[PDB]
Design an enzyme around this catalytic site. Structure first.
Site, mmCIF file in Angstrom:
data_model
loop_
_atom_site.group_PDB
_atom_site.id
_atom_site.type_symbol
_atom_site.label_atom_id
_atom_site.label_comp_id
_atom_site.label_asym_id
_atom_site.label_seq_id
_atom_site.Cartn_x
_atom_site.Cartn_y
_atom_site.Cartn_z
ATOM 1 N N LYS F 10 48.554 113.043 98.851
ATOM 2 C CA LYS F 10 48.376 114.000 99.863
ATOM 3 C C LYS F 10 48.653 113.189 101.343
ATOM 4 O O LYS F 10 48.422 112.169 101.610
ATOM 5 C CB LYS F 10 46.858 114.492 99.772
ATOM 6 C CG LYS F 10 46.540 115.291 98.517
ATOM 7 C CD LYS F 10 45.286 115.741 98.618
ATOM 8 C CE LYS F 10 44.985 116.617 97.371
ATOM 9 N NZ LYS F 10 43.630 117.073 97.105
ATOM 10 N N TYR F 50 49.383 126.046 94.507
ATOM 11 C CA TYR F 50 47.902 126.661 94.395
ATOM 12 C C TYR F 50 47.687 128.049 94.130
ATOM 13 O O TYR F 50 46.964 128.675 94.405
ATOM 14 C CB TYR F 50 47.113 126.465 95.787
ATOM 15 C CG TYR F 50 46.987 124.824 96.040
ATOM 16 C CD1 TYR F 50 46.240 124.122 95.362
ATOM 17 C CD2 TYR F 50 47.704 124.210 97.527
ATOM 18 C CE1 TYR F 50 46.047 122.682 95.496
ATOM 19 C CE2 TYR F 50 47.314 123.166 97.669
ATOM 20 C CZ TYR F 50 46.574 122.165 96.706
ATOM 21 O OH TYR F 50 46.368 120.940 97.018
ATOM 22 N N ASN F 112 40.692 114.063 99.853
ATOM 23 C CA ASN F 112 40.369 113.317 98.699
ATOM 24 C C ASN F 112 41.700 112.532 98.177
ATOM 25 O O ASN F 112 41.787 112.140 96.730
ATOM 26 C CB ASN F 112 39.753 113.838 97.630
ATOM 27 C CG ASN F 112 40.452 115.010 97.026
ATOM 28 O OD1 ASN F 112 41.874 115.389 97.360
ATOM 29 N ND2 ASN F 112 39.795 115.933 96.194
ATOM 30 N N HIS F 115 46.153 114.495 94.202
ATOM 31 C CA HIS F 115 46.213 115.672 93.411
ATOM 32 C C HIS F 115 46.763 115.047 92.126
ATOM 33 O O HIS F 115 47.652 114.327 92.095
ATOM 34 C CB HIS F 115 46.998 116.634 94.029
ATOM 35 C CG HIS F 115 47.568 117.499 92.831
ATOM 36 N ND1 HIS F 115 46.708 118.641 92.475
ATOM 37 C CD2 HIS F 115 48.426 117.453 91.872
ATOM 38 C CE1 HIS F 115 47.371 119.379 91.189
ATOM 39 N NE2 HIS F 115 48.087 118.510 90.925
ATOM 40 N N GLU F 126 53.655 122.071 87.200
ATOM 41 C CA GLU F 126 53.790 121.229 88.505
ATOM 42 C C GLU F 126 55.040 120.521 88.694
ATOM 43 O O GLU F 126 55.553 120.341 89.636
ATOM 44 C CB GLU F 126 52.444 120.486 89.028
ATOM 45 C CG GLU F 126 51.215 121.443 88.952
ATOM 46 C CD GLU F 126 49.859 120.709 89.017
ATOM 47 O OE1 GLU F 126 49.996 119.600 88.914
ATOM 48 O OE2 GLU F 126 49.033 121.430 89.183
HETATM 49 N N1 LIG Z 1 36.323 125.534 96.558
HETATM 50 C C1 LIG Z 1 37.289 124.729 96.852
HETATM 51 N N2 LIG Z 1 37.766 124.202 95.694
HETATM 52 C C2 LIG Z 1 39.134 123.324 96.068
HETATM 53 C C3 LIG Z 1 39.512 123.235 97.359
HETATM 54 N N3 LIG Z 1 40.623 122.430 97.240
HETATM 55 C C4 LIG Z 1 40.725 121.946 95.992
HETATM 56 N N4 LIG Z 1 39.832 122.656 95.084
HETATM 57 C C5 LIG Z 1 39.769 122.605 93.840
HETATM 58 O O1 LIG Z 1 40.191 121.313 93.372
HETATM 59 C C6 LIG Z 1 41.539 121.357 92.557
HETATM 60 C C7 LIG Z 1 42.260 120.265 92.814
HETATM 61 O O2 LIG Z 1 43.555 120.887 93.647
HETATM 62 P P1 LIG Z 1 44.082 119.761 94.822
HETATM 63 O O3 LIG Z 1 43.562 120.422 96.163
HETATM 64 O O4 LIG Z 1 43.554 118.390 94.563
HETATM 65 O O5 LIG Z 1 45.596 119.636 94.534
HETATM 66 C C8 LIG Z 1 42.009 122.821 92.735
HETATM 67 O O6 LIG Z 1 42.826 123.407 91.757
HETATM 68 C C9 LIG Z 1 40.510 123.637 93.102
HETATM 69 O O7 LIG Z 1 40.140 123.783 91.752
HETATM 70 C C10 LIG Z 1 38.956 123.638 98.479
HETATM 71 O O8 LIG Z 1 39.390 123.660 99.643
HETATM 72 N N5 LIG Z 1 37.769 124.537 98.206
HETATM 73 MG MG LIG Z 2 43.590 117.067 91.644
#
Ligand SMILES: Nc1nc2c(ncn2[C@@H]2O[C@H](COP(=O)(O)O)[C@@H](O)[C@H]2O)c(=O)[nH]1
Ligand SMILES: [Mg+2]
Ligand SMILES: Nc1nc2c(ncn2[C@@H]2O[C@H](COP(=O)(O)O)[C@@H](O)[C@H]2O)c(=O)[nH]1
Ligand SMILES: Nc1nc2c(ncn2[C@@H]2O[C@H](COP(=O)(O)O)[C@@H](O)[C@H]2O)c(=O)[nH]1
Ligand SMILES: Nc1nc2c(ncn2[C@@H]2O[C@H](COP(=O)(O)O)[C@@H](O)[C@H]2O)c(=O)[nH]1
Ligand SMILES: Nc1nc2c(ncn2[C@@H]2O[C@H](COP(=O)(O)O)[C@@H](O)[C@H]2O)c(=O)[nH]1
Ligand SMILES: Nc1nc2c(ncn2[C@@H]2O[C@H](COP(=O)(O)O)[C@@H](O)[C@H]2O)c(=O)[nH]1
Ligand SMILES: [Mg+2]
Lengths: 149, 149, 149, 149, 149, 149
Positions: F10, F50, F112, F115, F126
């Site tokens: 990220k 997403y 974090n 991904h 993906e």
């Molecule tokens: N509630 C919430 N869940 C999130 C958020 N960003 C990611 N997630 C959760 O963490 C997963 C990882 O997605 P990433 O953002 O790491 O690509 C997502 O599919 C979702 O389930 C956010 O801002 N809020």
């Molecule tokens: Mg992830």
């Protein structure tokens, strides 16, 4: 006041699984990743890359060693063309200074891990050969104020 | 037969979050930490630190870049004043030898991570400027028999 | 086209617990571990190891410093005798180049972490002194095609 | 939304020369160094630090082991009091999780490298014991936008 | 209050050239190298090593994978038999905890880098099998006062 | 018996200049780089990435944080989808296990670092979203015999 250079991790860097260590060395100086792509080098593209060596007796074996996965990269920084060459070290690892990539990782010129442009003219030629314009990314490093004077 | 030198991590070292890595380089040689303090350098103290450059045209900008958090340090070891300068590398990171701090981390002289005393005289003056005597800690390294001949 | 050199981690390398780091530096170049043995060096074997210094005033204290745990090693690679010497750095750590073992870890010649053979004849002699032929292990590195020309 | 915790490298951390490595672990998460001081811990200050253990049979030996050079530190971050405890690992290194400081570096509880505050209340008390307010430095990390949500 | 365990780097650890990294993990905790030898494991010695598995259908392929260079080691420390097993992690790397050797380096049980004794009785049996008494070295770590309570 | 997962560094991983360190963690297990591309993520591709969150109140700000440089990656290995998730650690860095990427580098879920695909179906989706088939590179790791059963 920054420039861009073409750096390519050769198949030995991929196969010895030191890609991350190589990238970390350039990130450590605050050099910016402007482009990065994994591909498999082929003879036709390697012939253009090594066009200056067309016809020389070592070229076929060079192309054979380079036919494999490579990581194409563009790094940006102050004086980065010359500085990346200094960081790689001498073509022959036995002559390279301690602390350089080739001295720290390698034994012989034919397996010396990485390629970097030797000049501004070569950097433009090599970046154009291995990358499309869309693959060169423009953004600013957030730590710029502490990297550049 | 040991000396003490003044080493200061500049604001770029703090902000790039490489303090630990810098300290580890000096610990690695068995150099002893005799003093250590985080502070924020201010123009008045920097004016005294850089007193040799009184009146020079670059001093105002030098003081500006150095106004910020710094880590004040005293390291003890054999020949440590000259040796710490060797480890830092040339003032200009682009001229510094691979394996030195400035070559490994930096690009330009104005953001070259770290200061170290240039002589016995400067070390004594700089330690006295940034530390009170009660801040200098005397203890013996448990591995002394394997560090010193 | 490879050769073998004798490398010995001295008691200070054992006691400062940097054995792994030392080994990793040679593995990093694709040098092959051909032999390895922890032992406690005795004056009797050290007198022969240092036979070239019989009758010199520093020899008694040298044998004394070296009477302790050592890691005997044989590494194989292209030009590895001279290259390992380059990687160790100058006898005196303060004269050694940044990025060498002695410059990175040590302060004084009498505690400079590691010994390496200084020539092809010395390597043959030292390997034979510290190792029986049955202790020297022959195998091929799986990455050979990416290490050697 | 950030907190500050008191972390202290104990004499074994100083003597084993792992100060830099410890600091790097906290910097790696984008925790900010808000204060740092080398001192020699004395029984009177340690008595106050360990005031909760007044009268217990183990306190005299605890004070003895802690009498020595220490690095006093304050780190700032989200939830950093609890998180630094997680990073240190269990009091007993043999029970601590791999990847924690105590599991990675230590063997026994009495030589477990580092102290960290166990609560908001203890952090406030410990910071006040070992630091004057003028020693606590306020600045913003340049990478804050990429560390904090 | 210390014990000794038998640890063996398997041929994948040798061939992936991570010997030094493995050793460093055990040195990092102040464990003492009491014995170390490179050999080439053979079927007859591996049959004794894996005597508990005589006749099981996986044994022939196990012996085939283990016929190769290995590094025999004895490490000494508090609770080191159990602690070394914890540091290696689960037999199956996919089940091993992050931070363990097998989780950090490996994918499958048949190539899981390292062996360690599972008990005091096994440690005695394995040390006797792979080492002669002369190869076990008695000396004291100079940092003992800071490793042991 | 291997599979492929989509891993994406990220914008915070790019800006904190830890790309190399992240890559090295996956290379360390013998996972194979099958694809790699630096790009600047757009809202249009992030909406599809997403898609499972269409209509949720956090999605606009999530797309905003992610609109910036990213390193798209495909890694191949045994069980690599689930294993890469284990190596990343819990979504919330404060809940993640020590030794995971998120616990070692990060503080909050919204920053974090990385991904990774959460299932076999998500990985297929993906990979296809961020990479054309011609960008996926097939080659064999030379160390395969020492990585796989
Ligand atoms: N509630 C919430 N869940 C999130 C958020 N960003 C990611 N997630 C959760 O963490 C997963 C990882 O997605 P990433 O953002 O790491 O690509 C997502 O599919 C979702 O389930 C956010 O801002 N809020
Ligand atoms: Mg992830
Ligand atoms: N632009 C710039 N030049 C510097 C700075 N510090 C030193 N220099 C220049 O770099 C040259 C090399 O430094 P030296 O190796 O002599 O210490 C000096 O002649 C000095 O003019 C700085 O912060 N900024
Ligand atoms: N010309 C020039 N020299 C500088 C500048 N900053 C530092 N120097 C020189 O480089 C030396 C080392 O700098 P320090 O590491 O002490 O800040 C200084 O003592 C001074 O001689 C600058 O901005 N310009
Ligand atoms: N003058 C002197 N030379 C030494 C001493 N120890 C080693 N050397 C030199 O450095 C070389 C390296 O030997 P090592 O002691 O590293 O096995 C020796 O053969 C000798 O030339 C010493 O105590 N005094
Ligand atoms: N021998 C010894 N035991 C300790 C020391 N510090 C804590 N312990 C013990 O270790 C146990 C585990 O610590 P806890 O995980 O509860 O913080 C405690 O019940 C305490 O008795 C120490 O320095 N030495
Ligand atoms: N029983 C016992 N507990 C100890 C000892 N040293 C420390 N502890 C416990 O472990 C906690 C953490 O120790 P610290 O890291 O603060 O020295 C202390 O606050 C105390 O509760 C010791 O020698 N014996
Ligand atoms: Mg020598």
């Amino acid at each position: 006041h920054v420039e861009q250079t073409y750096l390519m991790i050769k198949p030995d860097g991929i196969q010895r699984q030191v890609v991350g260590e190589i990238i970390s060395r350039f990130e450590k100086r605050g050099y910016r990743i402007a482009a990065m792509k994994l591909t498999i080098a082929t003879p036709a593209i390697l012939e253009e890359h090594y066009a200056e060596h067309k016809g020389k007796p070592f070229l076929p074996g060079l192309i054979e060693k380079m036919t494999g996965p490579v990581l194409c990269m563009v790094f940006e920084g102050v004086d980065v063309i010359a500085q990346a060459r200094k960081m790689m070290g001498s073509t022959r690892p036995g002559e390279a200074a301690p602390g350089t990539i080739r001295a720290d990782f390698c034994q012989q010129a034919g397996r010396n891990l990485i390629h970097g442009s030797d000049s501004a003219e070569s950097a433009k030629r090599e970046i154009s050969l291995w990358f499309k314009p869309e693959e060169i990314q423009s953004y600013k490093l957030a730590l710029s104020d502490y990297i550049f004077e």
